[PDB]
Amino acid sequence: FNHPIQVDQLNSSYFKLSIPTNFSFGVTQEYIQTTIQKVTVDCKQYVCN
Amino acid sequence: DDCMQQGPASARDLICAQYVAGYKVLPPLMDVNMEAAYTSSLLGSIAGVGWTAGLSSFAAIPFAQSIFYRLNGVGITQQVLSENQKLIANKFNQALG
Amino acid sequence: VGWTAGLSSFAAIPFAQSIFYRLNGVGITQQVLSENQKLIANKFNQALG
Amino acid sequence: FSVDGYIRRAIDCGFNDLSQLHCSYESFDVESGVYSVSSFEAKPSGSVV
Amino acid sequence: NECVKAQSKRSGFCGQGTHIVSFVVNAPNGLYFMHVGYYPSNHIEVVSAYGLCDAANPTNCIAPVNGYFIKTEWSYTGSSFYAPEPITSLNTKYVAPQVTYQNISTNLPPPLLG
Amino acid sequence: IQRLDPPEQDAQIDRLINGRLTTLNAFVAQQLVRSESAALSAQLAKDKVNECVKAQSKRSGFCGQGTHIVSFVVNAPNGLYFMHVGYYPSNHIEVVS
Amino acid sequence: GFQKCEQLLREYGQFCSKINQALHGANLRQDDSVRNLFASVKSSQSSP
Numbered sequence: 001f002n003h004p005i006q007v008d009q010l011n012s013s014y015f016k017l018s019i020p021t022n023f024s025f026g027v028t029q030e031y032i033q034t035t036i037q038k039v040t041v042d043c044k045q046y047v048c049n
Numbered sequence: 050d051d052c053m054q055q056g057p058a059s060a061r062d063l064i065c066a067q068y069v070a071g072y073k074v075l076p077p078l079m080d081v082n083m084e085a086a087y088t089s090s091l092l093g094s095i096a097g098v099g100w101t102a103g104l105s106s107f108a109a110i111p112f113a114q115s116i117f118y119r120l121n122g123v124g125i126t127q128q129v130l131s132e133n134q135k136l137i138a139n140k141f142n143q144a145l146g
Numbered sequence: 147v148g149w150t151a152g153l154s155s156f157a158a159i160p161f162a163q164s165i166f167y168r169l170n171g172v173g174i175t176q177q178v179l180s181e182n183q184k185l186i187a188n189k190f191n192q193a194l195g
Numbered sequence: 196f197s198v199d200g201y202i203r204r205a206i207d208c209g210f211n212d213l214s215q216l217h218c219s220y221e222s223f224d225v226e227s228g229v230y231s232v233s234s235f236e237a238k239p240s241g242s243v244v
Numbered sequence: 245n246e247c248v249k250a251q252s253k254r255s256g257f258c259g260q261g262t263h264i265v266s267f268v269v270n271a272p273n274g275l276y277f278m279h280v281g282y283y284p285s286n287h288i289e290v291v292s293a294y295g296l297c298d299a300a301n302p303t304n305c306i307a308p309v310n311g312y313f314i315k316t317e318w319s320y321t322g323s324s325f326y327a328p329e330p331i332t333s334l335n336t337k338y339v340a341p342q343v344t345y346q347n348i349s350t351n352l353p354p355p356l357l358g
Numbered sequence: 359i360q361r362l363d364p365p366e367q368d369a370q371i372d373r374l375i376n377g378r379l380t381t382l383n384a385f386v387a388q389q390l391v392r393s394e395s396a397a398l399s400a401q402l403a404k405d406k407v408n409e410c411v412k413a414q415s416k417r418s419g420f421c422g423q424g425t426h427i428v429s430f431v432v433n434a435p436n437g438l439y440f441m442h443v444g445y446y447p448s449n450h451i452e453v454v455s
Numbered sequence: 456g457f458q459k460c461e462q463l464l465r466e467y468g469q470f471c472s473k474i475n476q477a478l479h480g481a482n483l484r485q486d487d488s489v490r491n492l493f494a495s496v497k498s499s500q501s502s503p
């Protein structure tokens with residue numbers, strides 16, 4: 001199990017902020033199907049040849 | 050082994066039927082402790098994740114403090130939330146209780 | 147298209163200019179974006195490259 | 196078949212592709228569209244033994 | 245409509261991280277999305293305030309806008325990137341006073357200098 | 359096999375085969391349907407964690423009923439169990455605005 | 456386990472191969488579904 005960064009709470013009127021000091025860009029790739037191949041069948045031929 | 054040593058728990062035992070009928074139930078991708086680890090760490094993130102702009106920073110603020118911001122953001126004024134903090138906590142506790 | 151209120155108008159602004167507004171809108175201040183414009187473009191280019 | 200049972204109109208289902216379409220829907224009235232019908236069969240022009 | 249024609253604020257809907265821009269090209273049986281996200285790194289822990297009040301004028305209080313008030317006395321940082329800058333009227337809003345706001349009596353930021 | 363010879367034996371076995379092949383096809387078809395259904399549903403859970411648990415939602419009726427304040431998630435036997443805490447108004451009065 | 460039945464079962468083509476492959480694919484889909492879901496519930500940062 002990959003543990004998240006642990007950030008403790010303060011027993012005060014303040015809070016602990018975990019804030020980035022660096023960054024990168026990344027690309028999440030996603031494929032969304034929209035169609036399927038359209039097929040028809042010559043049923044009579046398929047069955048009885 | 051359990052289905053050989055003890056046998057079927059009852060009539061129509063679909064677990065012992067596995068080794069008779071010829072089918073097998075497979076275990077899940079994650080065990081119980083790992084699944085619990087995910088929802089546990091999720092719980093600990095609620096107060097400090099839902100708070101401000103961006104998904105990149107974390108504000109480790111008290112749960113109670115988060116709730117009062119959640120309530121203020123839906124139309125309950127701060128004067129009301131301040132006066133009724135114990136009433137709000139009690140009503141919340143009743144809802145979960 | 148992604149820039150302001152309404153879906154009816156179109157602001158033909160540079161792509162780069164749009165990105166800096168997209169970044170400002172998620173919590174990166176304008177002083178940072180101004181200082182790091184070339185760094186940002188480079189990191190973006192690495193992500194797509 | 197008319198109400199009085201006589202046959203006044205008919206389709207020869209094997210005459211052409213449009214006739215095949217009407218027969219597959221059992222109707223003289225079919226919708227507009229592009230429909231697959233039976234393939235044009237190749238026939239033997241001889242035999243080998 | 246959500247990721248390509250707009251910047252999304254929905255976590256995890258487009259890509260991972262914070263969504264910036266998406267592109268679409270055709271794929272063999274559909275569409276291929278390329279979601280460019282902002283991914284933070286090297287997080288540090290700092291001490292922050294919920295807001296700041298003028299100690300001499302307790303009803304005059306400010307809160308950060310899309311960022312945080314951090315110690316360094318107080319400065320502002322954008323929420324997604326640590327880069328302390330002066331607290332100004334452009335990065336704050338006036339708010340009702342709260343028991344969790346700090347009482348500032350010395351080097352007050354401009355919004356509190358009544 | 360014990361009772362019949364091949365010309366009749368085949369016919370009787372063939373009845374059992376066709377029956378069992380039908381059963382297995384039906385089983386597989388339902389597992390594929392149930393699997394697809396669950397997969398879609400897993401996406402929905404993903405959206406609710408991101409929308410209701412990690413954030414306060416402004417979408418009426420998406421999380422729970424009433425005005426969403428906070429949600430919690432625990433594991434359930436075949437999925438996730440969401441507990442959406444909402445704000446429910448009562449004793450409305452009419453005022454002039 | 457009856458050899459006589461298996462002989463007749465072969466006349467139905469690769470029936471069992473299709474059953475096994477279909478269920479295998481469905482079972483992989485379930486693992487991908489879980490892996491994907493939990494990857495998203497997972498927090499980057501959290502308090503103890």
Ligand SMILES: *[C@@H]1O[C@H](CO)[C@@H](O[C@@H]2O[C@H](CO)[C@@H](O[C@@H]3O[C@H](CO)[C@@H](O)[C@H](O[C@H]4O[C@H](CO)[C@@H](O)[C@H](O)[C@@H]4O)[C@@H]3O)[C@H](O)[C@H]2NC(C)=O)[C@H](O)[C@H]1NC(C)=O
Pocket residue numbers: 013131132133297302341342343344345346347
């Ligand atoms: C920055 O300055 C502010 C302003 O002085 C300061 O916040 C105030 O703190 C006092 C406590 O020191 C709050 O006063 C009371 O605190 C007790 C805590 O137990 C409450 O129970 C009291 O509530 C009752 O009395 C109220 C009327 O006075 C009723 O309205 C209420 O229903 C209860 O009967 C009361 O809250 C004071 O309210 C806050 N001020 C505000 C605006 O909230 C703050 O602490 C200073 N910052 C720091 C870091 O010290």
Ligand SMILES: *[C@@H]1O[C@H](CO)[C@@H](O)[C@H](O)[C@H]1NC(C)=O
Pocket residue numbers: 011012
């Ligand atoms: C410290 O935590 C305890 C609870 O463990 C609480 O009663 C006490 O008031 C806290 N101290 C401060 C300064 O908040």
Ligand SMILES: *[C@@H]1O[C@H](CO)[C@@H](O)[C@H](O)[C@H]1NC(C)=O
Pocket residue numbers: 021022023024285286
């Ligand atoms: C940011 O991280 C990259 C690696 O991803 C590193 O090369 C770069 O030097 C880092 N910048 C800072 C300021 O740490």
